[PDB]
A paper describes a structure:
Here we describe the 3-D structure and catalytic center of the defining member, EnvSia156, of this sialidase family. We show, through ligand complexes with products and sialidase inhibitors, that the 3-D structure and active center are indeed an unusual arrangement, with family-conserved histidine and aspartate residues defining the catalytic mechanism that acts with inversion of anomeric configuration; facets not previously observed in the canon of literature for sialidases. The catalytic domain (residues 6–376) comprises a complete (β/α)8-barrel fold while the C-terminal domain (residues 377–502) consists of an eight-stranded β-sandwich. Here we show that GH156 sialidases define a distinct paradigm for sialidase action with His and Asp acting as Brønsted acid and base, respectively, in an inverting mechanism that is unique amongst all exo-sialidases described to date.
To explore the 3-D structure and molecular determinants supporting the unique catalytic mechanism described by Chuzel et al. 26, the structure of EnvSia156 was determined on its own and in complex with N-acetylneuraminic acid (Neu5Ac), N-glycolylneuraminic acid (Neu5Gc), 2-keto-3-deoxy-d-glycero-d-galacto-nononic acid (KDN), and the inhibitor DANA. The absence of related 3-D structures dictated the need for a selenomethionine approach to phasing, so a selenomethionine derivative was crystallized and data collected at three different wavelengths (selenium peak, inflection, and high-energy remote). The resulting refined SeMet structure was subsequently used as the starting model for refinement of unliganded EnvSia156 and complexes with 20 mM Neu5Ac, Neu5Gc, DANA, KDN. Two copies of the protein were present in the asymmetric unit, each composed of two distinct domains. The two copies appear to be related by non-crystallographic symmetry resulting in a dimer, discussed below in light of the interface analysis and SEC-MALLS results. By coloring the structure according to homology, using the same color scheme as in the alignment, it is possible to identify a highly conserved pocket on the “N-terminal” face of the (β/α)8-barrel that sits at both ends of the continuous groove formed by the dimer. Considering its position and conservation, this site is a likely candidate to represent the EnvSia156 catalytic center. The identified conserved pocket indeed shows the presence of three 100% conserved arginines (Arg129, Arg 202, and Arg246), hinting at a sialoside-binding region, although one of them, Arg246, seems to be too buried to be able to interact with the carboxylate moiety of sialic acid. EnvSia156 also displays several highly conserved hydrophobic residues forming a pocket that could potentially accommodate the aglycone moiety of the sialoside substrates.
Numbering used by the authors:
A (entry chain B), B (entry chain A): 6 to 432, 434 to 502
The structure:
Amino acid sequence: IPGISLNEDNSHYFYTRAGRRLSAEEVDSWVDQYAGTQVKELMLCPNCMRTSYASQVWDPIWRGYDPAGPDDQPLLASLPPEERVAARGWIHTAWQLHQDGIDIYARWIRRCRQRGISPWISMRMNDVHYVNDERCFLHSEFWRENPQLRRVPYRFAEWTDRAFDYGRAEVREHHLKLIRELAARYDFDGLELDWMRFGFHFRPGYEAEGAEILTAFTAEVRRLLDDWEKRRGHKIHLGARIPSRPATALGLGMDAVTWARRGLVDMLVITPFWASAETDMPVEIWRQLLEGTGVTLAAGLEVLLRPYPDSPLFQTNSLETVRGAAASLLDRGAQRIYLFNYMDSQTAMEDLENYPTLLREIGSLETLAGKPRRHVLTFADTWAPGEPRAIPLPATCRPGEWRAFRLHTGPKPEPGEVIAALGIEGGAIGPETLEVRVNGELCAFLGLVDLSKPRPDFPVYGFSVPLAAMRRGYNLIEVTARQELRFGWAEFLIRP
Amino acid sequence: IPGISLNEDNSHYFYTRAGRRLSAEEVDSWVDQYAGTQVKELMLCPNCMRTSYASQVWDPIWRGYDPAGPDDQPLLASLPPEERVAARGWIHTAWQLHQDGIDIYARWIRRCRQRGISPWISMRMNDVHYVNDERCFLHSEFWRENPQLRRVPYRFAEWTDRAFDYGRAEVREHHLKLIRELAARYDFDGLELDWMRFGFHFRPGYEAEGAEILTAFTAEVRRLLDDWEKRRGHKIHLGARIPSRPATALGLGMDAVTWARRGLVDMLVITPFWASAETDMPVEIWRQLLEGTGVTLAAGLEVLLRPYPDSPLFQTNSLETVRGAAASLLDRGAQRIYLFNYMDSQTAMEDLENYPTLLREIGSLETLAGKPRRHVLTFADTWAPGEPRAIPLPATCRPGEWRAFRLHTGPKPEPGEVIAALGIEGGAIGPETLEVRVNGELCAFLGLVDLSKPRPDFPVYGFSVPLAAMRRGYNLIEVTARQELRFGWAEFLIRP
């Protein structure tokens, strides 16, 4: 009964369906796969710097496009030949839909409500994909013509260095033009402000002024949706995607607690940016912070599952690891699981055959109960400029030294098997090299565990945990090594 | 004004006054030094595992003590000869005060009340000094006799490994016995549960059971003090010391938000343990978390000022660095500055001559306004077991890489000088080796800055900050190096 909010990105459908002349029937059919699942909202994303629909106030993705032209034309010249094919798949599908009189978002909204699903629009507030390429097809001419409105003029080490400065009146007006249009054109149940594309909206050091600025921006959004409530004749919700930890959120100018108390938002999605799902987010603290605000707290997952920032592994969540994350987050008080990058092809879980099952399971403690789950230790990819970073992995244990990992495994395990599993980097160990404890209780060596994807490319050793040791919420692995070892990977596998 | 809470420890007064037969008059005069200052409460600590007064339910410090005996007597046998002198200083001074019919805490309370100070009692809930020495004079026989009631049977790597487990009913009953005595013996304005001595009260992994357990204990303490409120004829306060971040506090089984909303406490002191004052604590988040509960939030300082956990420096805070910390925390919303280990001698500030100045200044932004101050980058000493740790220093910058440090400098500087100062560990920089920006603005090279204590034992390079670049709250130092460099120190010096 918590249920699922599922984000469809601005590019995905247009990439994957490229080369088909799409009917209105086919466009409608995309919604159907979500019908009869635990999905309660579809977060339809229509924009990056450019819109995928035929905007009057912004550049559509197909501005500058020669439909009959060669791949090597001005709009695509700046890409290597192979990437032209994929960009043009997005540009042409988006364009051809418009040429055929099909507004893909109007059709998805309408179809959502026939299928009992609540349709939302989710705007990317500050997308910066490929800003290293000034001539790239998907940048707005507004962005190309106005380098003075970027965040960081004194260097370029990161894409976010060329993000728009929301400190500027010009930049806010530019984003509010898109919103006024989205509210006029589309009869959505709610508008999501997606600050998490890419999280960085202010000059470094100006984030406190920025906080006051984004609260006032949010209030205008609410004030405008209140008008459209009267025009549409039903309630319109306003939500936002913000960082996973309160301090990082306030440090990037997102004072969501003020938004919630002033009645500006009624949904908050705490989430990472992209590098990895966070299996561990302080939901319970957010729940105290939002007490009495009537706001729906949504725990955001991302498709990637990686143990540390610098890992060369780029594997996605499985059904078992989303069951793990979802079990934990609901256990902590998440009033929704929110999927970002869990689409029906290309950007999707590694085990796509289990997507129907995933959408019928991860929305409830009841539907996860007694099912194989994996609770994997990751990290938070987004920190406010100069904020010290807390990254568990990797972790060296010198001989006779103790190392601890806390992993959130949510509901107490049902009768069955519990493994603490630990991967060791380098090139290894005896069954008495580690001493492994969970909540103080000795764990028996099991040996090499053969993991399903996602899995590291180094040995993973399994440790059998006494059932009764496991608690509700966090559980503590404690480990001492007789030899110096680097841990690259930690998890609990629970098999009832 | 917010004002000052000042903690006098269980040991200090008896250590420093050893060797003099003390008169009631001299005992009383100790309170007078705190009269007419911004000090509002004295937090008078009367215990570790043993009491400094003549307790009838716990061991006084002098249990085992032969007044007439040689230093080499069974109570002090386990210490090296020259530490027996200091130990016996405390024990003898404490013991002699009882024999002269002087109750130091009854007199202090009384004298506080005459000099318009609010007198508190602060109990150490789980002190473990020197628990490596099971024969040590300051451990309770109850501790010595009950190894099975400790937190961690499976290893001894830290003193907190031999702390009492409040998971056990006999451990809570043991501490409730002293509270029942302290409430009957002493007519205090409030009782402070000092959980931060040493902050670790539960078996590793049981900290969520712990949360329910400490809340139910705190409630019992509140119900007890409600009885004494009726006998004493006036309101009795309950406060507590807890970790500096909300996740770490809940992670150590201290759910102070529950305590506050259920009206169990009316004061909370966010604080480090010992290793360094924290110049940066999320006061503003605690203020949101505590909204409507009627609790006073106090920001706790410690006397040490150290850049990172493993630094070999052990210098203390100065008047300038305490003004720095105090300006910041008060700006962030602290309703009190709390000092721990800032006493009149031995354990105190490096510049003791400035103690009367400090006690009339750091309680208000008004009295701090227009005075030199130093905002030094430190670190949180205390993390929940297996909680990922965020430590800013030391920081390596590779050639052509960017490193940022956010430092909280509180109120916008008045007209005058601002220096960003950066200390470099290991073996030779030029005036262009570093590019230093504050809030994006270029800072001019100044050269080697000769710092007042506290100061690192490596070169400190100063950068002149355009006055107008400084903002209220955090200020961001960005630096890129042309050579690989490790930073061991970072501060803002503001000179009005």
